[PDB]
């Protein structure tokens, strides 16, 4: 169990990684560019992105929420990358307001999105 | 495992060199300025035998007593991959850039164990007009010449030419460099001192390449890349082999009749490179090599040392 | 042809297909009835404007508001010129033409322009230059000049052209697919965030991304071009080139390709 930005002690025992000073999102572009062999060794996120790639089924849980839309298609795109040796999957985390299911009926009624206007 | 010379740090590497056919032509015109004329267009569009179709340059220049003319010459030499190969563009070169001179003479360069037709072949543009002669030289040795008509007068052309065998090419040292302009003069008296050892010339424009040329590629049947590792715009990330106050890189190629004129000429270039180095800002010289396996020769930097 | 706007805006507005290529063809009265209101009850063009017309490849919209949405949109020919401010999408998907803005604009302004020259005298808003909701990609192709200073994603994922900004804010050159932006001024916080391909030249910047390293400060030949373009165009930005640089590589997360300029001190 590896983290980014979590708790550095919790009750649940687990490799806790430091964030970045500029936040969550300045910290996924800096881990994707250790895992495309972009940026030389030794630091923190290079033991990170060397135990990512060493896995079989492996899943990044996130909140797009907190994440943001540009960390959310940098972290998708680290997927990318992993993908090309092992197997890695998002835990994409539902919001509490039901608006994940308001997305799937208003797909299929309307043909879109929510956020839509039948002014014409 | 760090070497240093005359204060400039030189890499512990071998420059990996290949077996080459080689021959040598003297050119002679009635005044030096068109023996030159004749040659330059000879050399042009040879940097290289992958692409290009040979590898030449010219030796040196000759004076009417060193050459059996009497008039004054040049040395040239050619490189290629086959005997065939080195044949097929030495007739091309000859015939269209030779002949077309004006009061030019081709005579034979260089000695060796394999004979290539060069007179005995241009002299059917003389449509049976030509003729052969058959003379003695100063040192004693009977020579045949062909005698081909044409406006100016005749285009004398020896025979046969002679390849030596063992003819090396691709050693090759770089240099890196903080700015183009200052490293580009480092360079420069680089290859000046490698034109003078006999027998070896440089093909590349100048004497210096700037692509590196990489075996290999990133994508499907790639032969030749260039070399991101010295790539200054491809610096800061992994697989860069140049340190930050490296901005420039530049390769030198030499190519010699034998193989110990590519040692003493790639020795002259790292002696004179690197006395000269600090105050232009070389930062170190490296030497090219693919992996060992490719090229029989390996001219590792370290037996070159020894000042010349 | 000129659109005196009579007064303030009750709700957003639809200014798409109002170039002065269509109104020429439509008879004076005729194009008065064209509805240009986002809401059901809707807005007419002469509800909104004062229309005086001729047979011109010039237009004129003399008074602005911020709810003029889609204005200059897939603009194929002539001018359009509005005095004062303007609303989301300036110019989206313009062909080719000019397009000058006395005010500020909105966000969004000059997603997928394909060629002319779209011109804002005052301010951007966020996403200036980027691509909308879903797009592909952002600029593709019509060169943008900011006389202003631009909000967040100034060029997100832009794929073609040239933005010539003022200022800029932060996160300026996200996903940036390739391009050129020249901003003479200051730089937002984290620049070129998934930049892929592109040229991002500024005077000042503020915190840059741990995967941009530094090349060095090389005089390249490209910087002599691109230079003499904006010396060409009359751009404040082109005094910028005249010193030496220096470089930063495109973010690592993605192929960095890309490339990052500053004045050396
Ligand atoms: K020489």
Redesign the pocket.
């Given at each position: 169990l590896l983290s980014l930005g979590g708790p550095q002690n919790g009750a649940i025992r687990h490799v806790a990684y430091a964030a970045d000073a500029g936040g969550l999102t300045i910290s996924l572009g800096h881990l994707r560019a250790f895992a495309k062999g972009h940026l030389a060794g030794e630091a923190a996120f290079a033991d990170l992105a060397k135990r990512l790639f060493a896995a079989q089924y492996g899943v990044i849980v996130y909140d797009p929420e907190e994440v943001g839309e540009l960390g959310a298609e940098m972290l998708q795109g680290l997927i990318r990358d992993l993908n090309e040796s092992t197997r890695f999957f998002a835990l994409t985390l539902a919001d509490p307001f039901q608006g994940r299911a308001a997305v799937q009926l208003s797909a299929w009624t309307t043909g879109q999105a929510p956020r839509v206007g039948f002014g014409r | 495992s760090d070497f240093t010379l005359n204060g400039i740090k030189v890499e512990d590497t071998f420059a990996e060199a290949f077996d080459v056919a080689g021959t040598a032509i003297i050119v002679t015109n009635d005044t030096p300025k068109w023996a030159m004329i004749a040659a330059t267009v000879m050399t042009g569009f040879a940097t290289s035998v992958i692409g290009c179709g040979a590898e030449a340059g010219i030796?040196?220049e000759l004076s009417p007593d060193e050459t059996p003319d009497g008039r004054p010459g040049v040395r040239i030499l050619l490189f290629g991959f086959e005997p065939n190969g080195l044949k097929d563009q030495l007739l091309k070169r000859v015939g269209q850039c030779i002949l077309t001179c004006p009061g030019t003479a081709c005579f034979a360069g260089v000695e060796g164990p394999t004979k290539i037709k060069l007179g005995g072949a241009i002299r059917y543009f003389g449509d049976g007009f030509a003729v052969a002669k058959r003379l003695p030289d100063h040192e004693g040795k009977m020579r045949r010449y062909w005698r081909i008509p044409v406006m100016d007068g005749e285009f004398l052309c020896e025979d046969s030419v002679r390849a030596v065998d063992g003819a090396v090419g691709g050693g090759n040292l770089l240099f890196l460099g903080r700015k183009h302009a200052d490293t580009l003069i480092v360079a420069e008296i680089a290859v000046e001192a490698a034109?003078?050892i006999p027998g070896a010339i440089l093909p590349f424009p100048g004497g210096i390449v700037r692509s590196g040329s990489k075996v290999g590629g990133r994508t499907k049947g790639m032969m030749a890349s260039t070399n991101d590792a010295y790539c200054p715009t491809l610096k800061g990330r992994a697989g860069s082999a140049l340190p930050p106050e490296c901005g420039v890189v530049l390769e030198i190629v030499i190519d010699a009749l034998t193989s110990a004129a590519v040692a003493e000429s790639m020795r002259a270039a790292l002696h004179a490179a690197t006395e000269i180095g600090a105050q232009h800002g070389l930062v170190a010289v490296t030497a090219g090599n693919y992996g060992g396996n490719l090229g029989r020769h390996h001219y590792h930097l370290r037996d070159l040392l020894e000042k010349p | 042809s000129t659109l005196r706007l009579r007064g303030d805006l009750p709700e957003r507005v639809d200014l798409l297909n109002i170039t002065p290529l269509a109104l020429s063809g439509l008879s004076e009265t005729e194009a008065g009835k064209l509805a240009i209101g986002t809401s059901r009850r809707g807005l007419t063009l002469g509800d909104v404007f004062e229309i005086r017309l001729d047979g011109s490849d010039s237009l004129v919209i003399e008074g602005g508001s911020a709810r003029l949405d889609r204005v200059g949109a897939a603009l194929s020919q002539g001018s359009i010129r509005v005095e004062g401010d303007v609303g989301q999408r300036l110019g989206e998907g313009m062909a080719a033409g000019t397009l000058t803005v006395t005010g500020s604009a909105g966000p969004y302004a000059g997603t997928g322009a394909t060629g002319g020259t779209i011109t804002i005298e005052g301010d951007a808003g966020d996403h200036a230059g980027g691509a909308v909701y879903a797009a592909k990609a952002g600029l593709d192709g019509a060169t943008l000049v900011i006389k202003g200073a631009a909000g967040d994603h100034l060029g997100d994922r832009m794929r073609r052209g040239m933005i010539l900004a003022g200022s800029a804010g932060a996160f300026a050159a996200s996903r940036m697919i390739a391009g050129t932006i020249v901003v003479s001024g200051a730089l937002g916080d984290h620049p070129g965030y998934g930049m892929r391909r592109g040229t991002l030249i500024a005077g000042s910047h503020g915190t840059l991304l741990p995967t941009f390293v530094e090349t060095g400060t090389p005089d390249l030949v490209f910087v002599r071009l691109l230079a003499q373009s904006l010396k060409h165009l009359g751009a404040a930005q082109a005094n910028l080139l005249s010193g030496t640089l220096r470089r930063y590589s495109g973010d690592l997360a993605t192929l960095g390709k890309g490339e990052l300029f500053v004045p050396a001190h």
């Open positions: - | 030796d040196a034109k003078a | -």
